[PDB]
Symmetry: C5
Subunit: 257 residues, 5 copies
């Protein structure tokens, strides 16, 4: 399709505002936003994580006003919601030293968001190809030792919530022409969360040709991961803790051939 | 309201200058700027922090010269006051190693400020929905497991000083059109404070259309949190320590219809 | 080479898109992307690392559409480390950070490097310890002397073979490489956290200060990479380097030369 | 009223000097160091020895006599002098581990400098209002518990060298209109010094109206603090270590009414 | 000197390209690039470091094409630390970070410094401890007093000899050096990770605020450096400074002066 001119007039712009909840595993009715405590396999070959222990990608498909014109996503404001919850250092955590406050949430984090006019395209890569991923997840199939670095058979769409585990999928850099994505992995058991909030920062979604994601079938795709670190229980057991992400996207009508 | 032209001339600008004190809990008559020492609950479900153990958001409502014209906030200079107090490593503390100086204030910090033409709008998010917040604080009511990630029932206004606990409220990104807010949470038990001071830095408060916060009823709302970290006593017990925040805001008269 | 005008027209541009797999040592059939566990010699004179223990530079020579004097000129690069989220696997027979805790994540010394050129990357040999014996099957600084620990100009090579040039004994030669653009960061320390950014919105321009990108001799583009992310610690305490693949997308245009 | 700048080869001058640190100087061999740091048992009993307290440095520099013209400070180059001294890890130190080199200078730092046309204006803030500041220092008088966050009674001028302790005074952000100040407090017991040197970096001292500090009575005021960290002796006792600061200021003649 | 116009034409420009080796002490014939292991004095007054334990400033005086009034003006610099990947040798008589682990990498206090000038770098002496006795064969602050621990204006010198001026007791004199451009960073702490970037795409402009670079008196260019990367800990726990070489490429042009 050739991309032609932008429509103007009051009717030619719309905005989407929503939040995506994290999908950390939710091991019971009290533990939304947390994973199951992490257990370590006894051998490398026997790695077999339970579903409730695996954070997954979040995705939302947002219907847009029914419209060839297509909605074009132009700008994004985004923010992690509830950053201050990490100041709760009194809820049966593990004291940092005798008589001290509880160790706060810290350690490995992944903060990721994307906006596209279609599902985020994923490529599978595994730390350990002999990992058995659990029933109820969607994972790289027929994994081989090459899957530990790059196996081009592992292609997928982020088209279901609570399904695609964070650890075995990444955005496919060979695709995603119609999505804009951004992510940071910060590894290490002691890394401090650094979480900024403001309502004054905007990301522009236009490519080098001045064209944003074009929304196929009048749907906008939002995806996110916000694993903030791990919470350490009094006992020493550790659980991933996630937070929700706010999205505000401005869109305009674009004519295409 | 339609936003029209800025008024000019001698009478057309004013400035507000003030400071907001921190509200860290103030557990006795000698401990202004500190919280009660932190105790950890025996079970996750039994989390029940004392009011004096909970830092709260600070807020001041500043009356402006009586004026349709509205005062429009254009610029901000702001600074944390008393940064050098953290060099007192010679009292009541715990030696870092044998014969050493006292461990300084360090660990989790939250530094936050906002300027608006009405009260800061808040969204409640809790680390643990079964936490019992104490009498005398304003907290998310009817919390459910969903409140651990996002429950849209928890809406409030920062309309009372020394009342809204930092750990269960954040600025609501879905509102606050008439406020500009900025915050950073830095977690981890050993993170060092890094506090910059200068009288040469200005933040511009105008939005993408050149319009700043417009002060309803001729009132300016300033809000802050500056939890710098925790002080460690000889025994190992820890108390939050906060500092005051300076604000200087320049405003101009704006006609609206 | 007198560089003259760029060609225009639909036929005058092309793109290369590919990935380079990491070459960390691959000690057995199950450990692609990992090195052999690291052992330490008791003296400098007895340093004799096995090949499987040594990360090597990755390189690919990519044939371009045949020309002919026109040369393909590399103008822009998008690049990304592939599989960053694998580092969230803290459940696979690692070493618990404390009693009942999750496994220690991959961390420690990293080297992230990539280059795009119109010919093989030119290397200079430098060694931590001149008495290290590099193993059969690797290409290494020959006739090393104690001066090789700081600079010995005899140690010149081309990155012309995959999984052969060990990362620790070669660097890009700053005295050469006029027809390549290279970028690298070494972050040392046993506890340093990986910080890995991904996005499809970032482009690096490959043009020099005169507006000229690498010119592809014999219609070949050379891509090189190292992405040692840190070390994985096993339950036993033994440590292995872990690497990831790197994606490259390069835009090229036809340039006339004299 | 600020009017035009004078031109001509005679319309400019410069000041070049250095300010020595004032760390306490506990004996004839320990210039640049404080006395070893001890820890009082309680806030109430806190009574630091004069030789244990770093103080602000200040110099009042007479300028060429003018009279209405004033000297206007336009640019600053500044540098910490002697950064490589911190590579002496072989002198009376505490080995980091068996057979190791000495632990280097590290921990809490405060780096601060200012250039003004009159004395730096100070605001008193104290970590602990019951601290008894020693004879020979100038400190907040009639401190109350409110002095721990903000007590507007504690106003002073930095008008004497070796006298104003760093820990109980900061620049007063409510004043200092005729000064430019810059500082960073980096806390934590183990934080590493990061000290940059170059002769290629210039700070412009002009405000948003294009006006620099105007030198009242033809005096320029320079102030500094450069507490680099603490030096740990073999026994583990710790002392503040400071370094001198270079200033080069360019000034021009400005007419005023 | 009044500075007048730049000369143009093919003959009006020249380049200097070289490397400066680190001078860390070189305690024996196998340890070029390292210092002697660091020992600690038991008092301030007894501090008496041996020469081979003291890193020194590196300097090269580079003769330029003879001109005579014209002077060579240094305009741009490209510079790089050479051999950054040697720090990935964590298998050579180091100290395991934990049982069965790899060796602790080079880390801790670093100083990275370079300068380009039209005359010798001007130095100011400052000492950690004025009672330190600096060794025979070094050039050090003479007649040191307690004031030498903060600032003693007697301690003025020129960086005019290689392997001679210890890093720890000398810095560039900010009160002079008008005809030099210098840049340095000291990163302290015993555990700080080295962070070393390499690229052939970065240039530093040496022109001052008037558009004038360093002017080469007597047609000599002065290059100086220090690259103490950190300390290497051997198996016994003893620690030695480790340094690396620095590459310089400087472009110069002819400038008329009066
Ligand atoms: C935030 C929170 O709810 N923390 C609690 C955790 C948490 O619910 C689970 O770890 C989620 O996976 O549970 C803690 O107690 C558990 C459960 O009862 C432990 O005592 C473990 O119980 C076992 O029965 C089990 O889970 O199978 C046996 C196991 O050996 C126990 N683990 C340990 C380390 O003792 C917890 O500490 O993990 C309580 C915590 O407040
Ligand atoms: C700066 C300061 O005032 N430090 C003192 C603190 C401080 O006043 C409180 O922690 C503020 O909440 O108190 C220290 O003593 C306390 C009581 O004064 C402890 O002994 C605790 O007393 C209890 O009664 C209590 O609940 O507060 C019982 C508790 O078991 C005690 N805790 C400990 C760790 O012993 C203190 O160390 O916290 C003295 C300190 O100088
Ligand atoms: C990711 C992975 O495969 N980890 C396993 C490693 C790994 O395969 C090798 O270290 C790669 O070089 O092996 C672990 O077990 C090995 C045997 O496979 C050890 O028991 C070591 O075996 C030796 O035979 C050997 O030289 O490799 C002898 C050596 O003494 C043993 N080392 C130790 C520290 O016990 C491993 O822990 O290294 C298992 C791990 O899951
Ligand atoms: K398995
Ligand atoms: K593509
Ligand atoms: K409760
Ligand atoms: K809104
Ligand atoms: K050998
Ligand atoms: K060259
Ligand atoms: K007292
Ligand atoms: K004021
Ligand atoms: K001596
Ligand atoms: K000078």
């Amino acid at each position: 399709v050739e991309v032609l001119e932008v429509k103007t007039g009051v009717d030619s712009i719309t905005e989407v505002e929503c939040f995506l909840t994290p999908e950390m595993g939710d091991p019971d009715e009290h533990l939304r936003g947390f994973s199951k405590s992490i257990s370590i396999s006894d051998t490398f070959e026997s790695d077999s994580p339970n579903k409730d222990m695996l954070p997954c990608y979040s995705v939302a498909r947002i219907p847009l006003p029914n419209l060839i014109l297509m909605w074009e996503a132009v700008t994004l404001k985004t923010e992690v919601i509830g950053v201050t919850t990490l100041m709760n250092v009194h809820s049966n955590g593990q004291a940092t030293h005798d008589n001290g406050a509880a160790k706060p949430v810290q350690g490995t984090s992944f903060h990721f968001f994307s906006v596209g006019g279609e599902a985020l395209e994923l490529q599978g890569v595994v730390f350990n190809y002999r990992t058995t991923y659990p029933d109820g997840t969607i994972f790289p199939k027929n994994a081989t030792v090459q899957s530990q670095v790059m196996n081009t058979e592992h292609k997928a769409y982020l088209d279901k919530n609570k399904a695609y585990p964070v650890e075995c999928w990444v955005p496919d850099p060979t695709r995603n022409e119609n999505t804009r994505y951004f992510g940071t992995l910060t590894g290490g058991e002691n890394v401090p969360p650094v979480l900024h909030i403001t309502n004054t920062a905007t990301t522009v979604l236009l490519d080098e040709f001045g064209v944003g994601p074009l929304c196929k079938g009048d749907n906008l795709y939002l995806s996110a991961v916000d694993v903030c670190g791990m919470f350490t229980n009094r006992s020493g057991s550790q659980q991933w803790r996630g937070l929700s992400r706010y999205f505000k996207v401005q869109l305009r009508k674009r004519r295409v051939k």
